[PDB]
């Protein structure tokens, strides 16, 4: 078969998710479900009708309904935001396996406004932070914009859009730029607008300095 | 196809004697021969299979021998309960041919029959076919000739005799002779002859009688 | 536990059909060689038919075409359908099992069912007592003018068995049968001698006529 | 290579012993090895008591013709072996069924052959064996013991039976029409109309390749292709205990569904295994049955997977002008 | 116990023959299939095939039929993925996994390798890492710490143990600064220790 999956599954708050993959071979073969957090190797979470490897939280369950298999997550917390893949025995070949396309996931979170801790302070201030952060995306994405001279930035800017941090599942972010501290002595203002400061937590500090 | 012949069609032996019954097949049936025992009014009982093997629960005095076309069933010591008909059957072919049975009667000392008489009851009188019966109990020699008694004249009609099979305990017979008379004949004959009755034992003139 | 029971026998008009049946307990019938054997009154055993556990059926030459042996897995039943019956088919029929382990000897037998092929009609036992006369310890029950052969005479509902002498039935001049059962007891003071069951046979009648002293 | 599948040749001593019904697949295969299935057939159909295959087993069964390609592969099932597994039925012969000339039937107790619409077996009773022509069973003193060697069993044709993929009736009609086109002269095969004819000869021996595709009759073919594919299915592996015998139904089920029993390379590849850490006294070991695989036949422009496939001798009738 | 080990990274010239390895320990390596999956940067997971090292049997994805070759070395318990033509699209993370089968119904990759990142760089690798970062004031949420990083590839592998005083939290990730990338994280648990102290860094660039 092919084991088709939905490319993404909507944010199921703290409710129950029913990630599903369907295929012909799933009529007679169980589907093994693996999860992959971004930046880590895949981890097998279910490998039989409901058998679960040790260390996997009990909220993960497996079910088969005929031509379709389901991984059910009862309590969907921030830990479950990952890519979920189903694999099974190939229908044509008994020695071969077939993989699914993978299903995303989304959950909620709590806003925070932690900025970059230290911007490697040099003797001459090339540039301060003045970056808007997309940390704790409440829904969809509303990235901020930077303004060297109260206009859309065109100078080289390093976008530090980080992935999910394993310790704090909030998508912590930081950004800074280097300009050799020769050109920035002319202009003073450096303003970044997040447009979602209620949840993004815009940590932009005013520079107004050369 | 296969003919199965038992040579001693009828047999008679005393208790404790040795009895041999021979079965012969028209063609070789190897050892696929069985011996069955059938008491009167009962289903046959398998005694021996394979022409020598004894069926479980059968007394050890029964043995089977032979092979090919000749077989023999032997009772080492005849018992009073061994009176029955014995059949040889071939199971070599799907015809399962049975041989004509061998009747094994049992001899013993002569026993005096006990004679009883019974006139018809009131219901028999009102039916119109009143019958009088004479019963002979527990005698070994089955020859128990009994001429009927009306008016000292021999009667040949309406005399019906039934004799039981040999007993399985004391090997004694018992026979009932009934004469059926119409109401006019029964009413016009009040006395009975009580004449001679023949028996192997010395009981020539022993005969009960009734009047009325 | 293991046993075979016949049923369906009885009086049949010549050229009729009755379809004897045999119910098994402890035997799967469909897994055994099942045979029908018959015994004419006063004659020897005669093999009638056989069916293998594989379904092959064989019949005696005298019953070919008229008799049909069959099995039915439900109810665990072996049947013999008999057609175009004549007087030569009047006999007691036994269903038997040929056990291969015994070289196909008939180890299991049924009690047998008597089928009578005659144009005459059934009629009642019409029983009478023969109370012991003063001249001479035997009570007896008489069964006069009944056509169907099988008559069973149990005296004390099966309790009395000592001295029981049930004589074979003898064909009457008219064409019916007579039975002369008797029990010999010198004295019992009106105890178990009388007031007990006498007769029952194919019609539904169970006469219990009492042989009271005259 | 040509030896027993899982169980060595039987050594019987009690011809009256019952034949038990074994639910396990490996137990059925072991019974097939010892010719228990043929003995059961003879008991059911021929009024025979005892066993065939004494000391020789299925590996010593006589074949016609003597050179047999598929008898070398011990894993290829014959019609009797498929009958024991419920795959088909070897019907007891009737008088209308024809006995093909050419085999040496003298002394044979059981012999089966594939007929145009099925598979037909002939048996003999206890203490009997076939004559030279095979028409009659006559008394044989050498068969009186009831424990007979494997050369008393004759299997006719080079036949391999396998699980099939059912084909629609229209596909069967297309195959049958192509077969009729390939054999215009044939009219009746085993007393069954192949082509409509007006005047036909007497039946003659007819060596032909055929495939049984689970329909009214067989598809006989002259030009065809066959390819064998090893699908590594569960039926291709048998679990034994190396001295005790075949595994029980529960043991075989656990071995084939748990991936914990030991096995050969193919079983470990397809189902997994756990060697070492002996939990039991001696675990069951499942090994691949030695067969070339499942046969797929390209005939008449289509590829099918027949229930049975073989090259065998039937009786055919020719058109008479 | 059971584990599969792979090289941390493997840089190579585009168009050059390349060969990555996955070595198994803790079990009889020849009793399990070894499957290979691919992950493009920022893309999904795609499965190539499985090699049985017992007889070096292979079963490929139809997509990956001639692109890669899977080999086995039973003696040293290793599986190999080889290219002979690196191309440029092959810059991805490659995972090896042990396929655990339970009968004809279960296929599970219970044990997974850590992954080999193969890059058709078309560039060079070099990393300097030094910054004095004397204690100062600049505020609020942002504490003061030390942060050093600069290099082209992405083998961070910085494992200094701190956190109670300064610069001990998880490191920041890498951003493509033309041919380089930015510094690390220096968050402090409590701002009262903003003075800080220089640690041993322990930077290794395997490249
Ligand atoms: C010869 O006849 C045999 C019996 O007629 C037959 O053997 C098998 O016998 C058993 C019972 O004696 C039956 O098996 C059935 O019962 C089991 C449970 O005990 C079921 O699970 C099975 O599915 C089956 O229904 C059958 O009567 C029979 N087995 C089968 C599969 O039918 C032999 O098979 C006969 N021999 C030949 C060659 O046909
Ligand atoms: C094999 O074992 C013995 C001979 O060695 C016999 O077994 C008896 O067979 C009869 C026939 O059904 C059973 O009633 C007995 O229960 C069996 N056992 C014994 C101890 O008598 C026979 O030859 C063979 N077994 C069977 C079942 O036929
Ligand atoms: C692994 O299994 C194979 C096949 O069973 C065997 O030849 C080999 O010796 C085993 N390896 C070890 C280390 O036992």
TrEMBL record, chain D:
First and last residue shown, out of the full length, are 20 to 340 of 1073
Annotated source species: Dabie bandavirus (Severe fever with thrombocytopenia virus)
As for subcellular location, the record says: Host Golgi apparatus membrane; Host endoplasmic reticulum membrane; Virion membrane
Concerning its family, UniProt says:
Belongs to the phlebovirus envelope glycoprotein family.
The major lineage groups are: Viruses, Riboviria, Orthornavirae, Negarnaviricota, Polyploviricotina
For this entry, the protein name equals Envelopment polyprotein
Between which residues do disulfide bridges form?
7-30, 124-137, 161-308, 187-197, 239-286, 247-284, 255-261, 268-273
Q: Which domain of life is it from?
A: Viruses
């Amino acid at each position: 078969s092919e084991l088709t999956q939905d490319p993404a599954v909507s944010v199921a708050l703290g409710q129950t998710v029913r990630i599903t993959c369907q295929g012909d071979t799933l009529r007679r073969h169980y589907a093994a479900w693996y999860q992959q957090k971004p930046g880590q190797a895949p981890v097998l979470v279910i490998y039989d009708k409901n058998t679960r490897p040790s260390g996997i939280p009990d909220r993960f369950s497996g079910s088969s309904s005929g031509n379709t298999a389901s991984l059910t997550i009862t309590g969907a917390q921030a830990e479950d935001e990952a890519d979920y893949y189903c694999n099974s025995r190939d229908s044509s070949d008994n020695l071969h396996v077939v993989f699914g396309g993978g299903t995303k996931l989304t959950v909620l979170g709590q806003p925070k406004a932690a900025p970059s801790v230290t911007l490697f302070p040099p003797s001459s201030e090339e540039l301060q932070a003045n970056k808007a952060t997309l940390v704790c995306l409440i829904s969809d994405f509303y990235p901020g914009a930077v303004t060297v001279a109260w206009k859309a930035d065109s100078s080289p800017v390093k976008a530090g859009v980080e992935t999910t941090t394993p310790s704090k599942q909030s998508n912590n972010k930081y950004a800074a730029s280097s300009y050799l501290s020769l050109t920035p002595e002319q202009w003073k203002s450096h303003r970044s607008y997040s447009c979602q400061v209620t949840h993004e937590g815009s940590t932009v500090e005013k520079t107004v300095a050369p | 196809d296969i003919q199965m012949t038992q040579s001693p069609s009828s047999l008679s032996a005393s208790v404790g004697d040795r009895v041999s019954i021979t079965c012969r097949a028209s063609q070789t049936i190897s050892t696929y021969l069985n011996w069955y025992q059938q008491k009167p009014g009962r289903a046959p009982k398998l005694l021996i299979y394979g022409a020598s093997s004894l069926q479980s629960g059968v007394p050890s005095r029964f043995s089977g021998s032979g092979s090919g076309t000749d077989f023999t069933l032997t009772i080492s010591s005849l018992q009073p309960e061994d009176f029955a008909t014995y059949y040889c059957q071939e199971s070599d072919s799907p015809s399962f041919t049975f041989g004509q049975g061998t009747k094994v009667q049992i001899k013993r000392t002569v026993a005096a029959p006990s004679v009883f008489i019974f006139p018809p009851s009131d219901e028999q009188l009102k039916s119109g076919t009143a019958s009088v019966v004479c019963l002979l109990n527990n005698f070994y020699p089955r020859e128990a000739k009994v001429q009927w008694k009306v008016d000292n004249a021999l009667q040949s009609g309406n005399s019906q005799e039934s004799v039981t099979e040999q007993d399985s305990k004391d090997s004694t017979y018992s026979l009932s002779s009934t004469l059926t008379l119409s109401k006019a004949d029964y009413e016009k004959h009040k006395v009975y002859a009580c004449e001679v009755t023949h028996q192997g034992l010395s009981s020539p003139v022993t005969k009960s009688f009734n009047r009325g | 536990e293991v046993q075979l029971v016949e049923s369906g026998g009885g009086l049949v008009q010549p050229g009729g059909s009755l379809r004897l049946s045999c119910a098994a307990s402890g035997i799967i019938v469909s897994d055994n060689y099942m045979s029908w054997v018959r015994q004419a009154p006063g004659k020897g055993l005669e093999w009638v038919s056989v069916i293998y556990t594989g379904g092959s059926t064989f019949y005696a030459d005298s019953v070919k075409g008229r008799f049909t042996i069959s099995r039915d897995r439900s109810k665990n039943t072996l049947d013999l359908q008999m057609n175009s019956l004549s007087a030569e088919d009047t006999a007691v029929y036994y269903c038997a099992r040929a056990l291969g382990a015994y070289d196909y000897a008939f180890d299991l037998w049924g009690q047998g069912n008597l089928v009578t092929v005659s144009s005459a009609s059934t009629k009642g036992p019409s029983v009478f007592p023969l109370a012991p006369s003063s001249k001479s310890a035997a009570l007896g029950c008489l069964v006069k003018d009944y056509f169907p052969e099988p008559v069973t005479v149990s005296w004390n509902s099966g309790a009395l068995t000592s001295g029981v002498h049930t004589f074979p039935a003898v064909l009457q001049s008219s064409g019916l049968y007579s039975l002369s059962s008797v029990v010999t007891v010198p004295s019992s003071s009106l105890g178990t001698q009388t007031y007990i069951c006498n007769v029952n046979h194919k019609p539904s009648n169970t006469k219990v006529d009492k042989k009271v002293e005259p | 290579d040509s030896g027993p599948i899982i169980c060595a040749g039987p050594i019987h001593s009690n011809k009256s012993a019952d034949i038990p019904h074994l639910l396990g697949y490996s137990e059925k295969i072991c019974q097939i090895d010892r010719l228990i299935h043929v003995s059961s057939w003879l008991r059911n159909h021929s009024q025979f008591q005892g066993y065939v295959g004494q000391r020789g087993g299925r590996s010593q069964v006589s074949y016609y013709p003597a050179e047999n390609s598929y008898s070398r592969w011990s894993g290829l099932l014959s019609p009797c072996d498929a009958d024991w597994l419920g795959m088909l039925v070897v019907k007891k012969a009737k008088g209308s069924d024809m006995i093909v000339p050419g085999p040496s039937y003298k002394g044979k107790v059981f012999f089966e052959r594939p007929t145009f619409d099925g598979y037909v077996g002939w048996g003999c009773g206890s203490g009997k064996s076939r004559t030279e022509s095979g028409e009659l069973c006559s008394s044989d003193s050498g068969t009186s013991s009831g424990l007979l060697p494997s050369n008393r069993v004759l299997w006719i044709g080079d036949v391999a039976c396998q699980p099939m993929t059912p084909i629609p009736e229209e596909t069967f009609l297309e195959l049958k029409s192509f077969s009729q086109s390939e054999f215009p002269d044939i009219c009746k095969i085993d007393g069954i109309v192949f082509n409509q004819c007006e005047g036909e000869s007497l039946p003659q021996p007819f060596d032909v390749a055929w495939m049984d595709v689970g329909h009214s009759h067989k598809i006989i073919m002259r030009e065809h292709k066959t390819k064998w594919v090893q699908e590594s299915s569960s039926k291709d592996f048998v679990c034994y205990k190396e001295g005790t015998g075949p595994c029980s139904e529960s043991e075989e089920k656990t071995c084939k569904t748990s991936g914990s029993c030991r096995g050969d390379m193919q079983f470990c590849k397809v189902a997994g295994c756990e060697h070492g850490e002996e939990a039991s006294e001696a675990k069951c070991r499942c090994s691949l049955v030695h067969k070339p695989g499942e046969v797929v036949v390209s005939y008449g422009g289509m590829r099918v997977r027949p229930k049975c496939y073989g090259f065998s001798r039937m009786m055919a009738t020719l058109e008479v002008n | 116990e059971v584990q599969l080990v792979q090289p941390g990274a493997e840089v190579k010239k585009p168009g050059e023959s390349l060969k990555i390895s996955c070595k198994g320990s803790g079990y009889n390596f020849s009793n399990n299939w070894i499957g290979w999956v691919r992950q493009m940067p920022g893309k999904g997971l795609e499965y190539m095939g499985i090699i049985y090292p017992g007889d070096s049997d292979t079963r490929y994805n139809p997509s990956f039929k001639g692109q890669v070759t899977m080999s086995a070395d039973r003696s040293i318990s290793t599986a190999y993925l080889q290219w002979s033509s690196l191309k440029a699209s092959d810059t991805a993370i490659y995972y090896c996994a042990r396929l655990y089968r339970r009968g004809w119904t279960t296929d599970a990759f219970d044990i997974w390798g850590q992954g080999t990142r193969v890059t058709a760089s078309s560039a060079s690798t070099k990393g300097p890492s030094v910054f004095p970062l004397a204690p100062s004031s600049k505020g609020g949420t942002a504490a003061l710490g030390c942060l050093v990083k600069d290099y082209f590839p992405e083998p961070v592998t910085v494992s200094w143990n701190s956190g109670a005083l300064t610069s001990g939290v998880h490191t920041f990730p890498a951003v493509l600064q033309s041919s380089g990338l930015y510094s690390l994280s220096s968050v402090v648990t409590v701002p009262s220790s903003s003075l800080g102290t220089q640690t041993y860094i322990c930077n290794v660039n395997h490249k």
